[PDB]
Design a protein around this motif. Structure first.
Motif: not given
Lengths: 263, 263, 263, 263, 263, 263
Positions: A100, A124-127, A185-186, A217, A221, B161-163, B165-166, B169
């Motif tokens: 993060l 914790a990862a961005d994507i 998740v994305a 980011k 965050n 947050m996942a969607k 950030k996807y 970004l």
């Protein structure tokens, strides 16, 4: 590079694409994390800030699998020493905060399994790119301890309170496909193309505007940072449970391949 | 209306339905916003408070399209002088805060496209009606600056947050249909029915209880207000990027119709 | 207990499964809540902490229906005196906080209908099981008052602000299946299996680690606790509306079975 | 550490007492901070975690003076390029967060003067010992920019908003004695005994329970961490002001030793 | 401005010093605020935004006294109508928020007495100059209603919770001298010098950097904004008490110059 | 009354003045709290809500002394059992929240000593009256554990971060006189007048408006509630320290009345 793998045994570094620093980690079966690997995955972010040229980070587990989480050895070490318990406490906090607070975007290629600490790192990862059939599970309740290694910091803002409570309190697994549908998740792709798509995403981020990506980011965050106390409290509560009988029965049950009989 | 249209060039006012004040704005191609329109859409909310009889506001872009966001002229005016940059900073803040703090419900008829400030305005509205084929995109990262005109205040509590950030970004566009399924907008109807439905929604709100609607909207919006510092920081970071080489490359690539080659 | 049943008229207690305390409540039509029932459902949580052997609580309305919310009688009583209005204010607050602050997991078997206070209770529970055909509706705006008995505390972190505003401001009912898709509730099963599935969930919880469950639920609920002022404000605003012309018309219209003509 | 002093020019390390790591820094006149020094004081905290045996850190400026803050050179460098402005942005952030996030207690021996970044560092320390005659001043408003390098993160929870606004907006200096009375600093002693007392404090801390101190400091600092966005926004706004006419006149005025004439 | 005076009965505008806009308000005895003055002081801030040349605002009560707060007339108007009560609710909100969100620094020359709404206005100002003998009192508890017109938003961050609870719950007055020492106000001067000093402060601010001052005030005020829900809830709770017997007794006792005998 | 006296050994109840419920607690020397008393003081608040006629609560320790905090017996019990540790965890949390969430004002007559849990109870009260010579000390760092039983929730908003860190990290005691000057407590009177003044305060509160006081206290306390996670995290970290060697040495050295030598 060289200066770095020696310090973090279990981590391999490479540049599959321009600007993409790929970190491959190797643990025990299903990359269960021994004490050294847990500490390495939590502390490496500090040193990574010093690596020039990193525009994106790609996380991948060795052997075509992400991680089943902390190993039995790590868990037992924690239960045997107050010093180990607290050392791991801060490691657990940084395993999530490390990604993060890292300036560059982090992508995780979540292959086959992501449980406990493995899921903590994945989220914790961005994507995160998962396979439609990937198995995602917090797993702490089955072990006999609170879900304190990431769930309370990340899940609410990912899938909302209802889905979070349902999957965290009942220890109910999610397939990668279901996870993407909930918004955990994305992306969810064919299992065989998880690494491929994750690399594609990482490469694309490496092609983006470095400063603008860092700032975006970072600003996003702050949503998580505002709830850090909430997260650390859940982590502290989980660790207080390490001296309880529920964890004892949870481990014992897992070793004896029998359903747990919690007191 | 009278005095309003005189002070707000680019804005047209009408009462298509009882209690429904409709604001139709006109920019350049795809209603890109020149300096005057950006300022007008941001400041009009202050004067609307004095308009008697308003029970709901309906926002629509002239010519069957909402808005592609800020025009090249506006971006150039900002990067050219400190005084202009900061003037636009407060305008960008009010473009989102304006609708949020307006007492009455605001409905947006999002036709065809909503990008940048266009998306900010559309998502600042209480209820957005999009077409199944409407294109929704933040697009700041492609331009070379942080996503600071709304994304950090609104997206996390809309899609997670996942969607967030996807799509933010990677500058991954969303169709209206996909945006509704993620929870970014309330309804996605057939493209030619967007205005019709938006009007229906606005009229329903106008037929609702005024005080109760005001208080519910106000109370719900405190969720957003709690993250105002988060939002303003993202905006400030974006504006600090206006003096960087990344925006120079993005702006050049755009006008030059070519992929950006960020440093 | 035998003493609980005496202090809480309208509440039946039983242990359908080991460690699962089932509370079946009986109100008026569709279990609309009269003064005594609303007070009991809000204050029983305080006394349940004394009932030994509770590992999970299962909520169900008698007669195969959860609850249509506060009864006409309760609402009129509130409008008739400051004393009752404020007594109910604190009960309304407790109806939501009671479940949230109760140590053990709470499961709601939401059959057929959940409106107003009925929905508040259903959503304050940790896990809600609804039927595909169940009807969920906040309902306050149709009544002529702000959505202040739970919506501002729970909806945003469940379904996001866009879906929250759409359903709250327009009084647009959700089917159990739609509610599950949005994230408002965890499960939507066949109507005839709602109780069956809810009991299964409660039993599973009763079989889990009670300390770990308590801590996990507690840590997660801090997300809601951080927004308590937001909630209590919406509740206060709702109650200030009880002396307004809008509630008068809303009540008059509903009882006369005609569309409301708000001022 | 030798390697440690080599990487951070301007910083001297010593162990005046057992477990007390003393960092003496040297800048220009009144220890004004040159680019190298500002970055060093901001980044050293990351590496200090590597030094074993540290139970407390004591900060002191060389030459019997703490620091007048950023030097004219540093400020001009910031105004001269975007690259430098943003580099210093992250340094300013770390100059405050560094001490806050360092696990061990930090003591500052604030002799004679603490202005700007100098005050930021002094107040980021856990305990500051000042002299009755020490002069403490934020100083940004006289320079022509917002008080964004620490004031918005630390002052409110130190002296309250009234005293914060008075001294920050008017650029009204505080004597060490007045600062103690307001609660800005813990102790104000005879100028001649500042270092002596600060060392005594650091020694007492080094004799205390390491883990307990770490956890107590960390828990208390979450109060500051909750307002990080507030702080970072003030910092971003200050930096946006670096391209404005006010800073231009601000510097022009001091370098010409004449009162500023802001537009 | 003639336009402002024309629209704001009870308010006088003047420029005693360059860039210093002075607002002198006149109510009844001790400037008790009738409905029109309360509303005017609350709404004037919105219109002041359009006044060119304002670098600082100075608030002063006519006749050598600030204000004893709302008049009996205003209180009775509130108790007599729902519409009047809610109208005043938003006015009370803006009386505090108005100065807070006004871009320029606001100085209050608090002569002799500041009670209730008078204290709210004085403390909402950025800098308050009081006389050593000035009387400062919230006074709501004596009237029979909660302290919801400013105390919950401002006092905690001004004097701490202990002093806040002591003076607010007990209706214990504070002299200007005692208030400055607690940190409630910035300066306490000789009674005859209050205006003179307040004007001096206002002029200094007008001579300061406009943009920097705006940004610093804005950034600092986010501390208050973060607790807006807390404040609005206290206000709503106070207003719900207007239909209670305690206000009836407090109001009756006050008019009958006798101690209240609360039920 | 009889039912309370019958259920809470160690606690005595009386009505020294109309509406003032006085709770006198008796522990070991200096009223050190044995397990039973600690739990009693923490849980009595729930049952007090049932007692009719309470307008204010007055807390006093028997024998002219408040409390030295938890007894050696209690600490040893916590250290020897996981079950005991966690049961006390929730008791400690309630010892502070109990008074905070109780509807009526609570006054503490803090005579001679208030340390650890004793100070926690004293500061949780709405108004504390101390003697000029009373000794107030957190004392946890001396024992070898983090200050987690109240300090992180209460101190920052009472005395500011500088004074909090100084007294909490160094284990520096405060005299009642110094504590009032810092803002930790409301009043400091001659030691002999403590109970007399505290009773006077309690009586005055009992003569105030019941509902208005409840609402004002409730609204103000949301300031503390917003930082509950911060508090609970500090409490959890403290309890994690019970299995560490620091507490072991702290107790050993304490019982052997020798300076502790932490590892």
């Amino acid at each position: 590079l060289a200066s770095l793998e020696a310090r973090y045994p279990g981590l391999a570094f490479a540049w599959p694409r321009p600007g993409v620093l790929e970190i491959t980690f190797r643990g025990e079966k299903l990359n269960a994390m021994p004490p050294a690997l847990h500490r390495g995955l939590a502390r490496v972010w500090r040193d990574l800030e010093a690596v020039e040229g990193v525009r994106a980070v790609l996380l991948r587990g060795e052997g075509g699998v992400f991680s089943a989480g902390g190993s039995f050895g790590l868990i037992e070490e924690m239960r045997a020493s107050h010093e180990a318990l607290l050392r791991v406490f801060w490691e657990a906090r940084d395993l999530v905060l490390g990604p993060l607070n890292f300036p560059r975007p982090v992508v995780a290629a979540v292959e086959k399994v992501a449980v406990g600490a493995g899921l903590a790192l994945a989220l914790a990862a961005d994507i995160a790119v998962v396979g439609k059939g990937t198995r995602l599970l917090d797993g702490h309740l089955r072990l006999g301890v609170a879900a304190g290694d990431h769930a309370v910091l990340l899940w609410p803002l990912l899938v909302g309170m209802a889905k979070a409570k349902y999957h965290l309190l009942l220890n109910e697994p999610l397939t990668g496909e279901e996870a993407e549908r909930l918004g955990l998740v994305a992306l969810a792709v064919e299992d065989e193309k998880v690494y491929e798509k994750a690399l594609e995403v990482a490469e694309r981020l490496a092609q983006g505007p470095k400063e603008a990506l860092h700032h975006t980011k970072h600003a996003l965050n702050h949503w998580y940072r505002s709830f850090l106390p909430h997260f650390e409290l859940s982590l502290a509560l989980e660790f207080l449970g390490f001296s309880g009988k529920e964890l004892e029965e949870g481990l014992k049950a897992l070793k004896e391949k029998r359903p747990p009989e919690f007191p």
